[PDB]
Structure formats: structure tokens, C-alpha cells
From a paper:
In particular, three members of the cytosolic aldehyde dehydrogenase class 1 (ALDH1A1, ALDH1A2, ALDH1A3) have a key role in vertebrate development. Indeed, they show a high specificity for retinaldehyde that they oxidise to the potent differentiation factor retinoic acid (REA). Human ALDH1A3 has a key role in vertebrate development by participating in the synthesis of the differentiation factor retinoic acid40.
Here we report on the first crystal structure of the human ALDH1A3 complexed with REA and NAD+, which has been determined at 2.9 Å resolution. The final human ALDH1A3 model contains eight identical chains per asymmetric unit, arranged as two independent tetramers and a total of 63 solvent molecules. Each monomer binds one molecule of NAD+ and one molecule of the product REA. The crystal structure of ALDH1A3 reveals a tetrameric assembly with intimately associated monomers. The structure analysis confirms that ALDH1A3 shares high structural homology with all classes of ALDHs and folds into 13 α-helices, 19 β-strands and the connecting loops, arranged into three functional domains. In summary, we observed two different and linked conformations for the REA-NAD+ couple in two different monomers: the first showing the REA carboxylate pointing toward the C314 and the second showing the product conformation with the REA carboxylate moiety oriented toward the protein surface. REA binds to monomer D in a closed conformation, with its carboxyl group close to the active cysteine and extends its β-ionone and isoprenic chain moieties along the whole access-substrate tunnel. In monomer C, REA binds in an open conformation with its isoprenic and carboxylic moieties pointing to the opening of the catalytic tunnel toward the protein surface. A remarkable difference that we observe in the active site structure in monomers C and D regards the strictly conserved E280 that shows two different conformations.
Residue numbers in the entry:
A (entry chain B): 22 to 343, 347 to 357, 367 to 508
B (entry chain A): 19 to 507
C (entry chain C): 20 to 508
D (entry chain D): 20 to 507
Write the structure that this text describes.
Amino acid sequence: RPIRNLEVKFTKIFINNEWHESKSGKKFATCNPSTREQICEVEEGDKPDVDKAVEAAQVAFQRGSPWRRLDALSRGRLLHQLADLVERDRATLAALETMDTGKPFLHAFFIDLEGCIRTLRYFAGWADKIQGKTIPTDDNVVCFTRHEPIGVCGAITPWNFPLLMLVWKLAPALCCGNTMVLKPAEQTPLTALYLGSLIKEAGFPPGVVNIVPGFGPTVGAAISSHPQINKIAFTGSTEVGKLVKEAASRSNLKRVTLELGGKNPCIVCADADLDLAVECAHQGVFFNQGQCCTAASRVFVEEQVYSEFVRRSVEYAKKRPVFDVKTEQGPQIELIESGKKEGAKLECGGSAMEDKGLFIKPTVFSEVTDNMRIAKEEIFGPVQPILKFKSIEEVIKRANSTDYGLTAAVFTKNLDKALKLASALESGTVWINCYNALYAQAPFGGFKMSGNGRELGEYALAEYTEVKTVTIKLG
Amino acid sequence: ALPRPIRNLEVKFTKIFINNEWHESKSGKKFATCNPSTREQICEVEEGDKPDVDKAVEAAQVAFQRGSPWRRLDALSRGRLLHQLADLVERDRATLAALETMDTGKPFLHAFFIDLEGCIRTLRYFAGWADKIQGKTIPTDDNVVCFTRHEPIGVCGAITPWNFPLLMLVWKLAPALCCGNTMVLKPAEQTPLTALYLGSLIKEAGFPPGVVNIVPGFGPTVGAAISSHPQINKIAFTGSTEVGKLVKEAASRSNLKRVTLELGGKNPCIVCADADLDLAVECAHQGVFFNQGQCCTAASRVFVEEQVYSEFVRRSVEYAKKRPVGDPFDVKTEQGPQIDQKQFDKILELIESGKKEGAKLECGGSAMEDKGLFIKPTVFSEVTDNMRIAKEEIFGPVQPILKFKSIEEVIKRANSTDYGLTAAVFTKNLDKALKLASALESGTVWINCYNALYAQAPFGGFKMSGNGRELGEYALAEYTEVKTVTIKL
Amino acid sequence: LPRPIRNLEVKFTKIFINNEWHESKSGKKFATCNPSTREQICEVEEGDKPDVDKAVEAAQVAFQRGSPWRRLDALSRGRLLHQLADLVERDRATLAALETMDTGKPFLHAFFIDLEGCIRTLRYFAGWADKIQGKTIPTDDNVVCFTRHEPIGVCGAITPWNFPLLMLVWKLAPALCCGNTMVLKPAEQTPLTALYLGSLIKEAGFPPGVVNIVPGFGPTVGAAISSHPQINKIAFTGSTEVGKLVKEAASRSNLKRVTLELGGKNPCIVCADADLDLAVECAHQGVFFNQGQCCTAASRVFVEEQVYSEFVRRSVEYAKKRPVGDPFDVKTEQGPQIDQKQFDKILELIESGKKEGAKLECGGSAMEDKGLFIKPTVFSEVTDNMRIAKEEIFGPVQPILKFKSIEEVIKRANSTDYGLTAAVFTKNLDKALKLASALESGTVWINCYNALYAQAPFGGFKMSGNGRELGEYALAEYTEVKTVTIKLG
Amino acid sequence: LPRPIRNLEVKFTKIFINNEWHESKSGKKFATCNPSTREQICEVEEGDKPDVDKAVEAAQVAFQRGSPWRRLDALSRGRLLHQLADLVERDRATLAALETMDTGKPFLHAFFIDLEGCIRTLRYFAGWADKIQGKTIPTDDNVVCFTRHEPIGVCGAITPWNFPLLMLVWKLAPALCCGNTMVLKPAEQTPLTALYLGSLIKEAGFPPGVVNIVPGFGPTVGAAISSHPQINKIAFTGSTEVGKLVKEAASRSNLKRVTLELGGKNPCIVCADADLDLAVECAHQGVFFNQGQCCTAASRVFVEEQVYSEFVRRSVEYAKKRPVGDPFDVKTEQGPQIDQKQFDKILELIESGKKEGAKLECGGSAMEDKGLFIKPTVFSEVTDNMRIAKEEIFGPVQPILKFKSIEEVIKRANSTDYGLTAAVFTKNLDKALKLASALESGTVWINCYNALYAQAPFGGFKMSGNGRELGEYALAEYTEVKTVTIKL
Ligand SMILES: NC(=O)c1ccc[n+]([C@@H]2O[C@H](COP(=O)([O-])OP(=O)(O)OC[C@H]3O[C@@H](n4cnc5c(N)ncnc54)[C@H](O)[C@@H]3O)[C@@H](O)[C@H]2O)c1
Ligand SMILES: NC(=O)c1ccc[n+]([C@@H]2O[C@H](COP(=O)([O-])OP(=O)(O)OC[C@H]3O[C@@H](n4cnc5c(N)ncnc54)[C@H](O)[C@@H]3O)[C@@H](O)[C@H]2O)c1
């Protein structure tokens, strides 16, 4: 399976199903986080490159265009085709993802790529099921709504789940007849660029998808400010998302959906299946080195089970292993101190591993409290702050005390507690006796400052459609 | 019979509504709203600023709070309160119509039968949605139970314009309340009256205290404090495009609160030779001129096919001149004063522009009499795409009539602008009508009609005419947050 | 709170057609009697095929195109429903009384349950009236495809005596909401309330012919409906055997559309981790409510071995102690059984339990004979084989069974040809959701019983009927989906 | 383009149960014949009640809780469906040939229509599988209320001879994506495609017992299905008379649920302001498509007075210039009438037009002396009362009526007990939309005919049937709504 010495075939700007060099001629250079060594130079796009791509997108989206004349099932066939090719070339994409992220290949293969496929097929099924409405009004009137495509849509995605995150936009966008302008992170532009090949092979017309790699303030900012981009979807940081919205509003009031991060709680009750709670919550905090937006950053446990839970979690940290079949965590592309200075107790880790890359030991705090920064600030790293609570009412308030709400998980055997907390928590997703359970068909998103809009599920389709009303009076 | 005008009406409600009680300014200060038609001040209203907005939002926050009387209601009870509140709006209907006529110059009958009828039907429409706001059960794995909950957002803000002060406020109030969240309103400074009245009724109907708060004042002040507030979660704005940008930006800078916008448009009205020319002429007239031409749905570009063009203009001239202008309160008046001195200028300045860019003036072209702010109905012909009266939002009684030859031509000319609120089409051809309707980049396309809106039919803009939608089942999307619950057994 | 009307005179006793009161064509009458005070009440007009013929033509002319009903706006149709729930509220106590008279229900149960129900249901569907939406469907680029959700037409409603007005409202509300016209037909034992409601339908302002009532007998009038060439849909609630007949009748005649609510043998399942008090009080109300003369009745109560005994003892403490008596007294929870016949039907079966060996824990005999009153009975050591946990008991009898495992209780509970309702008591999340999924009921309650909403659909599985009443799902039953496909040149 | 397989060799002839081929309990067989080469094709096993019991039993078990088919995840059910649409595509030419041999349908027509439909239908619903959603309903603060859309159980399908594979797929597609198990029963006159589809259902990986097929006769196997106490829903497409019977039996037995799709006396209304040329060709393909043997068939063509005479002249030109012949020849647009009973039935009604005074503009007879081929036939000056304006012909006959007023045509169109389809030709926005409202039909076409999509529901008003097929609307017919209500 592993393809360790894989050649990179695609490094240029995809626009109109043709490969392109920068207008400047500049390149920048991506690196294998694991080796620290350069992989290849890929083309560095800037403003003029974006204009080129957006004019492509507009032509493809023009009325009379081939892409627009396609009937509805056929937009669906194309995606089905595109999924098939991702699946065909699954191991490559998996291998390229590992090459730019450091993600374990098996993980990329079974998680990132599994996701891209399912999502692509999920949303192939919506293409002929995008329905407006016939609205009753007056006897002498025929009023209905059309769910039109918006137009040119841009995607701007982060480095942790590059392809997946990109695919979450692409799948629905195209399903609804939009045309796109993608920008993967500077750190990880390989699998995106590969996919563009696959988008050509699958048979999408020219300029329905265009890709310009580069930097945020150059390429990204060119998009968000662009007067002919109609809609945008960003996933990345709270700090940058605001800029995107700020930029959309100054420009053409383009539509923005944002998926940013969060201070996601896990809430463990005395009556929980304690083992599972320790297990899941550990998969919550530490998965991908804590470099996942769904990351569990705040673990709440009830007094009766507090000391027990911690022991078990300290037990979990040390015991799992460090492209191999057995590798569970890859390299990183203080808060730990301020926890010590503010009085929290550390039961394991607290420093780096051995002199081989930016790896932190799994670190677990106990005696944590709300006022602490390890409970207030996005760690983006393998730190497990366990906090104590007594009242289900207390924990509901404490849990909701951040400006975020992307995720929450609640462990309990009690039906009434399960649904209570579920209604009370302010989070786009509430897991009950699981963590990281996501589906192409279940919507995902954030409350409050974790984002706007939703991705996946039917709800996704609203973000890539413009509702037009046609109201007809009869004589 | 026609309700009888209340010319002597005494403003009862002038202060800041917060927690179901009236309060004066944190500063003490007050501003003054006048009657466009009398030129005479009506009264002084409390002037609000940040410290007041903050007092209000904490009411809204406390009432949205978990456990609060407002949150524990049945769905249907929330819906019943909405019904009650329309009942009061209908009982005090003539009174509320009169306020809106004193404040804006609107003909009394128009406010009575249009503005208030809208508020009523819309409150009732959304009263209806209260216990029909439904999430989903979603199939996944055998071992998993997955479903969504359409939750209320939290505190919602409303900032509205002067042209439809109550209506634009209601369009936001109705679904916002229907969906179980709390509010903080700011009406336009030029028109704070009818919204303040709506305060008293929202109390009488039995909405718990703190569910609705109304802090009148200015845009850069109260408008800004609302837009930027850390504990406001959604905002609905209706107003000038320029001020939307300002609001969306601030939302974006502050807490990423969510934002619906309704901005202006440059709405095309397309008339084909095979149209019923009378209907077309009659509809485009009311489309241009309704509400003193001060409405976003206004027809700022009438496009007419050459075969029927000359007569179109001829019939459209009749309607312009025959149209009664004068006292809002007189039963025969269809046209009242422009809201204030500024718009009266803006409109005049631009009318001169139409003559200074060479358009053939067919009626009016001037103020009507020095008394006040009354502009003659004006019609321009031999109009072209590049004149200012053909690019800019006139927001006054002015009917530009352009010309075209082919449908494919008129679609491009229609779609040339950055806005897309409304379009209208007149033709007897089934194919033309549906072609145009598909092609026009407007949120509402009308066919053989104009200004046909329904509470059940959504309203909003393409491109730079705005973001979300208002009215319809669609409107509940802007007041709900989707929460996904996923359970593994 | 509200004061009984002990001797209320019946005003409405005649055939309602075109908002006019008529007497039978034959001239016959029939007479309804009071279970609590066995005195005949009044004589009510007995109709037959020719009376039906007359209503169905009213209903047709009323559904005819151009008619005032048909031309109403959506919202206006909902206003009419809304007003009808207002008048039902005003005369609520009257209605409660007539129902309480005709059926024997405690007056207060008729007031806070039956009529509460009619009102909420009427108000809920008034709210659907302008929200009954079809679809625009993406097909080809050259094509406009959309569905219209149209009214079926003349719909007939045939109802039982256990909840005379409620069952009639479940059908009238959504039917009129989607724009159909109706012919109604209450049970012969209970024609009073319906006939009343006709006066209200007239007052509230629905045009003539929209709703007609024709009381009478089943094999006479009911059969004339089910067989009727110009009736387009039917809803029937009642017994299975009559059900199948109406379906057959329909198939032969014009393939009119049919939805059925029939009985069920509805299990309660109780688990050891249940809230034990809560589980007895729910199981108790559930078996015994409306003298056990309810389709939702719990006929088979399952209880886990560990927690069995103490269940039985708390059940009998509820059973002995619950006050039986005169409907009109504030403190009576149980009234007479509907009549002499249904009062004896059950007592036969009370021996079934004693015959095949089942420990009776309280009651067991008819109490006093000059009234239709059975003492609340509870059986224990009940088993699957026994007729008491197998045939529709139609009354106040609590068969309590025994089980060990969750898998055991899932096959047993499912082993009937019925599945209208189920209930589950446990504090466990996985067990509850498992069972909710596993059981084959149209409604599964969890730690509650008889929790119904005008919002939540109700209807059976298998032989318990077909179709759903209440909720959004109802409208499906009162509409005919039409597809309009248009190709553009 | 695709090549006829003229003497194809039939592989599948037996009863399909638990993904195994079976012989009748009787051992008896019945013979299938080719309408164009009046020769027997092969013998098929002939089922009866004991076979049906065997099949229902299989399908109960496959539906059983904990069964593999019940445990497949949402998306996987839609994967298997896609797979099958894959196999149907691969073997498209074999199948399209069987259907022509079985039915007399022009190979190319069966290929690019019947088989096209099946695949798009399969694919469409493969798509709904993970999108079948119930609702979360707000009630009290106290309460969590939601619905589930559960499969009903064992579904039966009974289908006619005119579109054996198509009509079967309209039922199987939504039934299988909603999680059901099925017992199929194709027409005795056209069993072959349904029997081939079993190998694909097997090859594609559906578990044993999910789909079962019992070829045979109406009163035996249909009646054993329709009456079965352990079959939960029945989908019937066929004659009104058998519809009624199926429905009664459903009622009498276990109150099983019933969808029906019956015939119609569909109108085609042509106004003077139509694109006459467009109207003539659409009406023409409407009446004669599938040798007239389709339930969407345009059996009353109303034409406004001005364009009436002209309309008739063009209609005969198409009528005579339509190639009738060997199904397998590329040029042939019309084939043989399904068999002898229909062939005879059609010709009597033609004589009925003659006996009642309709002006015959072409045909009026059989063609090649002793085949099952009828010359395309056009009647003119037709009136509402004649037998050709009243009874489903189901043959290449085009009865043409005249009208004056719209309201008159509305009334005349709606005068039958049927409402399956209608169609309207006009350029006029108002006139089209007014008729669309007024015509009591499940499907109204405007400036087209026979335009169906796997996303647009189809079904009857009035006695043309109850319930719907195709579109989201179909999933309701293959599911049972369950309300779950929790009190905290
Ligand atoms: N084409 C367009 O987009 C468009 C649309 C409407 C009006 N206009 C122009 O605007 C003028 C009148 O203004 P208007 O009331 O219609 O719209 P406006 O945006 O000036 O006012 C609408 C509301 O916004 C509030 N507001 C003002 N400044 C604000 C700020 N900085 N932050 C938050 N809220 C603020 C005001 O108080 C008022 O409540 C007219 O001359 C008209 O021509 C243009
Ligand atoms: N709308 C109508 O009235 C209509 C439509 C088409 C054909 N027909 C008549 O029927 C004949 C052709 O029949 P068809 O195949 O179109 O439909 P059909 O109703 O005769 O039978 C079609 C399907 O139903 C089955 N079936 C037959 N009898 C049954 C029974 N007793 N119980 C259960 N299932 C049964 C058949 O075997 C087949 O599977 C024609 O000669 C014509 O006269 C009537």
C-alpha cells in the first residue's frame, strides 16, 4: 500500500482544465513536515491569477454555457464519476496528503479520503432533488420559488484536512450548478491540485473548477475582495474568517459561510459508561495531535467520578504508539506553563518528545478551572484539561461560557440527562455516547463565533443557492 | 366605508421601551420628528445612545435566558401571542395608520390598507409557523440516532428605514418572535412613532417583559451600538446599500453575529408589444410612483419595445398628470410629500440631470408649489442606459422610459447593474414570460403584475441588493440555528 | 372551574345542508339517550341515502370552480378556521355539556380534553392553510416542472361515539384547510355535538355547502357515503370490521380515497430501571381513561420480574381509590360506560380472566346495576394466551403481564396484527431508543401516555389503519398532487 | 447505433426466491410468444399460491429485524441500487431485446426509452436512500417529539404487459431504497425481463429474499399476493377492473396498503394559437407511441375550429408515413399489437367508430393479412358520445374532436371518470396556466407530450388511480410514519 517515493505530477495553476504558470513567474515551495525537506516548487498565484480564474468561472457559469445546459441528473453523474476516480486514485491522494501534512497514510486513506468520497456521492444524489416551492396565495395567481445557483463561489481551506475540507465545499457547490475558484493553504496545495486533474478526467467543462495556490494575503485576499465572486466558504482561523467577511462586505456583499474553531467541551456524568468516556474523550483531545476543529479542549467530569476518570486518562496517554502500518500520530506542521502558574496539576507529559520534530508529549491537567487560559484559549495541541462540576445546571452554564459553539459531547446513561444537555448546550453538534461521528448527510457547523452557515446534509444546499420568487397574475 | 382620518392625533408614546416599561434617555436628550406635510414638528422623542442600547440588550438577553417565561412557552402559545398582537394592531389600526401618515407623508388610506394590512397578515402568517418549525430525523447507521433541532439564535437586532417604518420592523419582528428569540429594535430617526406605539401593544398582548425592546435614536450612534454588540446574535437591516456594508462589516468585526440585509435596487419593468398595454401601463405607473416613489421595489427602468413605445409613453403621461397630489389625510390624494428636505433635493437635482443629459421630458420636472416638499409626477422618454436617471436610485416620483428591440437584448440591459431586488415583465407570451423569469437576476420577478407581495412568499435580493430572505418559510432560516444531535447506542 | 349545565336543552337536531336545517326526506327520526341518567334526551332526524344524495351535491356545488369557497385566498381559508375555533371556545361549556350528556364523559374531561383538543387542532390547521406547498422540480434546461397540492374534493367523515366531536375535528380541520368540502356523519349514539358545530360553521362564515352533516345509522347513511359515486375521499374512525367494509365499498364504487383509524391492542412496557411511581400513574390513566373506551387504551401492560409485584399493588391503590360517579360532579374521574350493551360486553371478558386463571387485585364486578358503572379492575399473572390480553376489551381492565428480557418483550408486543400506540418506561437512554425503534406502533410514548399534539401525527400500523391524522402528514390525505410540466421553445 | 440481437437465447425461466431459481410446485409451465413472429419463445415456470407463500415467506425473513438487509446503512442501500443500475446499463441490449421479443416493442424504442427509464429511475432513488427524513416537531419545553419514516414491510408489485420492466422498476426502485422486501409478479404475457432482472439483483449483491419473482397468472398468483395476510403493501399497475379487485382483497385480508395506477381517457387540447406543427407531432407520438398501448395515450384530441381541418390533414400525413414493421429493423416505429385478444379488441372499436359516423381519414383495418399489425388510423368529426371517444382503445387510433370555447373544452375534458394525464398546446400564458389549473389530471403537459422524469411524480386523479410514483412523493408510499414522543 504505502507509496513512499511518490512523484508529484501537478504543481501548476488549474484554470479552464489547462495547466498554467504564474503571471509573475513566482513559485513557492512545499515541504514534507515529517522530513523537513522540500518536496517541490508549486506555482505562486497572486491577484492577476485570481482574475483569470474568476473570468473562467464566469464564462462557464454564463447562461447558455455547457455546464448550465446540463440537465440535473447529469450534474449528478459527473460527481459520481469524480468520486469513482478519487476512489480509483485513492492511495495516491492518500500518499500525497501524507506527504504535505504528516498525517499517517492509513488515516488519510481511511478518514480524509473516505470522507471525500462519501461526501461526493452524498451530494451527487441532491442534484435532481433541489426543489423550490409552489406557494398558495390568491385565486388569480401562480407564485413559486426557484432555487437558483448563486454563481462564482470561492473556497479557502486550512492545512489540517486540506482535501476533505475542500471537498466539503466543492460537492454541494457543484451539485447546485455553481462554478468555483479554489485556494488550498500554502502549506498543503498538492491533493487539491491533483483533484483538478481528476475534475478534468471526470468530464466537468472548463472553468467550472479552477485552482490557484498561493498565500492568504495575496491569493486569498484577492478572492474575498473580488467584485465578481458571488459567494465564499472559508475554513480556517477565527482571526482570518473575520477578515474574509470584512472583505466581502467592502467589495460586493458576496455571501460568506465560515467554519472556524472552538473550545469544545466533553461532559462526563457520574452515571456515564466511564471507560468509553475516557476512550472517546481521549480520541477527542488528542486525535491528529489536537489539530482538528472538533478537538475536545474542555473535559468536564462529575465529582463522584473525577479522580477515577483522570487516572484512566493518564493511563491512556502514554500507551499508544508513536507511512508505517502502526503509526498513529504524525508531526506538527506556553499554555502548559500558564496552567502551572495558575495552579492546575499535571499528571503526565509537560514537555517535548525527543529531538526529531515538533512533537509534544500527551499532557493531562487536573484541578483545572474556568478562569484558566487552558480552558479559555484554543490550544491547537495535545493538552487535556479536566475540570470538575457538581450540578448538571452548573456544567450547562460553564460549558456555554465561551464565544464558541462548534461541537459538544455528553456521556451518560440517563435518557433525561442526555436530551436535557443536548437541548441546553450551545453547539452546532452534540454527540451523546460518541465523539467525531460525522456524516455526509448530517449538517456540521458552529454557533456563535465558531462560524456562520452549515456544511454537509441538506442544509448545505441553502448556502449554495439563491432563492428567486416568480409571482404571476392571470387575467 | 373608509376609516375616518385622525388629523388631531396626539402622540402618546415617545420614550424608550425596555423591559415592558418606558424610560427616558440615559443622557436625558431628545430629538424631534416633524410632519412632512404640515412642516410642523409633531413631538420630541427620546434620543438614544450606546448606554441605552446596552440597557436594552441585557433585557433581551435576560428574557432569552434558559428558564425564562419566554423560553418555557409552548410553541403554540408563542404563536397565540403573535395572534393576539395582530388583534391589537387591527383594533388600533386607524390610530397606527395615522401615526405612519403623520411621520412619513404617506396617504392615510395607503398606510391603512397597505402598510397595516401587511403588518397584520404577516404577523398572522408567522403566528402560524410557530409550531411548524421542524427539524429533521436523518438516516445514518443502524446503531445511531441522528436528528436536527432548529434552535432560536438568541438576541436579534432590527434597524429599519423611514419609507416603511412599521412594515419593515414587523417583517423582522414576526418571524423573529415566531421562532422564539428576543429583540432590540431601532427605527429610523425620521420615523420613530409607529414603532413606539407598537411598544405599548406588544405589552398589552402579553409578551413577557424583555422579549421586545425599542431604542430609538441615530444611525452612527444606536445603529452602530447594535451592529457592533457582542451579545447580539443576528441582525436584520433594511436600508441604503452603503449602510449595509457598514453594518455587515461591524457584525463581522465584533462577534461574527449574523446578518440579513435588504438594500435598494434598480428595478427593471419590461414591456413587450404582445403585452396587455393597458395593464402594463397601469402597473408600471403604480410601480414607479407608489409611496411617492420612495420604495425599494420601485420601477426605476421601464423598458418598452419600439412597436408599442410611443403609445406607452402617451398612456403613461396621462396617468402621471391625472394622479392626485396633496394632503395625506384627504381621501382622494394618492401622492404626498417627500419625506424631508434632503430627498426633495436629491430627487430635484437628479431631475435636472435627466434634462442636462438630453432626455425628452413628458410631464412635471419641478417641485409643485413652494409650500412644501411636493414633486410633480415626472415622466422621461428617449431614455438610455448611461443617463444618471438610468443608473442611480431616484427614490422619487420619476418614470424613466427606455427602449429595446430584442428580448436577449433587454435581458443584458436589465442585468447590467450591481443590484437585483425586483423585476417585472409584461407579455402575453408563455415562452417569453418564463424565459425572462429564468434570466432576470432579481429575487422577485413579477409577470403581468407589480408590487404583488405575500407574507408567504419570500423577499430579498441578488447580488448587492441584499443577503438573506424575508417573508415566507424561508424567513425562518434567518432566525434559527441548526443543531445536529448524533447518538450512538 | 366552569359550572356544569345539568339540564341543557338541545337546539340543533336536524340535517345540516347548505347552512340550513332540514328534516329527513322519509320523515323518520331516532332518539339519543344519556348513560348517566338513562333518560332519552331528544329525537334527532334520521337520514338515509336521499339525505346523503342531497348533501353530496351541496358539497359538490360548493367545491365547484368559481365558488366563493374556491376563490378564497389561502389566508382567508385559515381565518375561517380561526374564527370557528373562537366560537368553539365561546360555546365551549355548552359543547362540553352536550358531549357529557350524550356519552357519559365526566363533564370536565369533555371540557379540558375533548374540546381543548378540537380547539387546538382547529387552530393548528388554520395555520397550515397558506403553507400547503408543492414543489418546483429540476428536470431539463428547457422545462419548467412543478407540482401543485390540490384539494381532493367532497370528503366524507364517519366517526365513532367515544370521542364524537374530537374525531370529527381531526378530519374537518385539515380537510377545510386544504380547501375541500365535506359531508359529515356522526355515530347514531352521539349525534348532538356535531349538529351543534354546524351552527358554528354557519356563524363563523364558511359558505353554504362547504360542510354538511347528515346524522343517521351506519348501515344506512354511512354505507351511502362509502358507496357514493361523487364522494372523492373518506376518513373513517371506528372498529376494524366496519373499516374493511368501507374500504371494500370504496373500491367497488369510484376508488375514492380512504384513510382509517381502527383499534389496536396497545402495549405498555415497563422496565426495572423505570421511575416506578410515574410508570404506575401512566399505565393507570392509560388503561382507564375515558372508561377504557379509547382507541389509545393500554390493553397489555408488561412489567419486568424484579419490579413486578410492587407495580401491581400501587396500580390497585390507584384503581380502588379513583372516584367513579355522576359526570357533572367536579371530583368524578370516571363516568358511566356508554350504554347498557358496551357495559355488558366487557363483564363477559372479566370472567375470561377468572375462567383461565388470573389473580384479580381490585374490582371485578359491575358496581350497582341501575347505572352503567364497573369498578376499576386490575388483573395480574396475566399471560399471552389469555383472551383478556388479546381481544379488544373496550373498558376499565388492567391486564398485567410478566417478562425478563428486552428481546422477549419486543416480539410479544409486536405479535398482534395491530400497532396504533405503544409506551415505554425506563430511565435508560439506549433501552428507550432501542424499543422506540423496535416497536411497530404509529406512536411510541416514552415515560408518558396519551401525550398527543395537533402537531404530531397519529395513525396505526398494520390492521390498526392506514393514513395519518394530525401533524403535517395529515394534509397529504386531503390533497391530490398534480404535476404541471411545461416545455419552452 | 446499438445492434439488434435477433435470435437471442433466453437463460432465465424459473421462479426467483432467496436468490435461487426454482421450479413450480406443480411443475407446470406456461408459454411465452413473440407478437411479431407468432412463434413461441420459451416456456416459463407457472406459479400459484404455494409458490407465492414460499416467496412471501422469504421476503418476511429478509425484512426480519436483525436481518442483513435491515442492518445495511443508509448509503449502502443506495450503493446496491446504483450497482443494479450499473448492471442494467451493462446488459441494456440483452434486456431491450427481451422486451421487444416479449412485447413487440421496437428494439430502439425499448432501448432508448424503456431501459433508459429503468436506469434513471434506479439511479434517482439510489439517491434518496440516505435522504429519507422524518421531522423533529416542537411541542412543549418538557417534550422531545420526532417522526421516523420506516419501511412498511413486504411489498407486492403487479404490473401490466405494456411496460413490463419499466413499471416493475417504478415500484422496486423506491421500495428498495426505503428498506423494504418485495414479491414481484409480472404479466403472464411478458415475464422475461422481470426474470432477467433477478440475475442482476443477485449479481449486484442484494441479500437473498430481498426481491422475489413469481411469474404466472392474475387470478392465481396476483390473487395470492393481493390477499396475502403477510404482505404489507401492494403496488398495482393495470386495468381499473383488476385494480378494484386488488383493492377489495387488500381490504378483506389484512388491510394492506394499496397504490394503483390505472388507465385514463386522456385529453390533448390544441388551441388555434398553438404551434400547430408542434401540436401535430406531439399529439401524433402521444396516440401512437407503443402501438397505442400506453396509459399516457392521448385518446381524445380536442382541436379548436380554425385550425381543426388543417390539424387533421397533417395528422394523417404523419399517420401514413409512420413505418410499421419488424421491431428489430432500425426504420420501424410501430410494431405488432401485443397479442390476439387486443388485436381483435382494437379492430372492433375501429368498426364502432365507423358504425357511429366518424369520418375515417386513414387505416380502419388490420394490415399484413395475418400478423398482429394494425394500420395507423385517424378518425375525424368525432363527438363525445361515440365509443372511440369513451373507451380506452389501447391501439393506434387517433380520435379527433372539435371545440369552440375554452370552458367547453375544460368541461368535456373533465367529463370522464379518469384523470391520469392531459396536455395543452398554446402560446398564451394565461390560457395555459388556467387550463393547467382546471384540468383534473395527475399530469398536465404544456407544449409537449409524454415528458416524464424520475423526479416528477406520476399518478391518477379520480378512477385513474390513487397515490404516486416517481419523485419524492413515491417515498411516502413505501414508508410508514412513526411518531416518537418523550417526556422528560
Ligand atoms: N440604492 C440603495 O442601496 C439605497 C437604498 C435605500 C436608500 N438609499 C439612499 O439613502 C437615503 C436615505 O437613507 P435610508 O434611511 O433609506 O437608509 P439608511 O441606511 O440611511 O437608514 C436606515 C437605517 O439605518 C440606520 N443607520 C444609519 N447609519 C447607520 C450606521 N452607521 N450603523 C447602523 N445603522 C445606521 C438609520 O438610523 C436607519 O435606522 C436616500 O437618499 C436614498 O437615496 C439608497
Ligand atoms: N383502465 C382500464 O380499464 C384498462 C387498462 C388497460 C387494459 N384494460 C383491459 O385489460 C386487458 C389487458 O390487461 P392489462 O395487463 O393491461 O391489465 P390487467 O388488469 O388485465 O392485469 C395486469 C396485471 O394484473 C394481473 N392480474 C390479473 N388478474 C388479477 C387478479 N385477479 N388478481 C391479482 N392480479 C391480477 C395480471 O396478471 C398482470 O400481472 C385489455 O384487454 C383491456 O381490455 C383495461
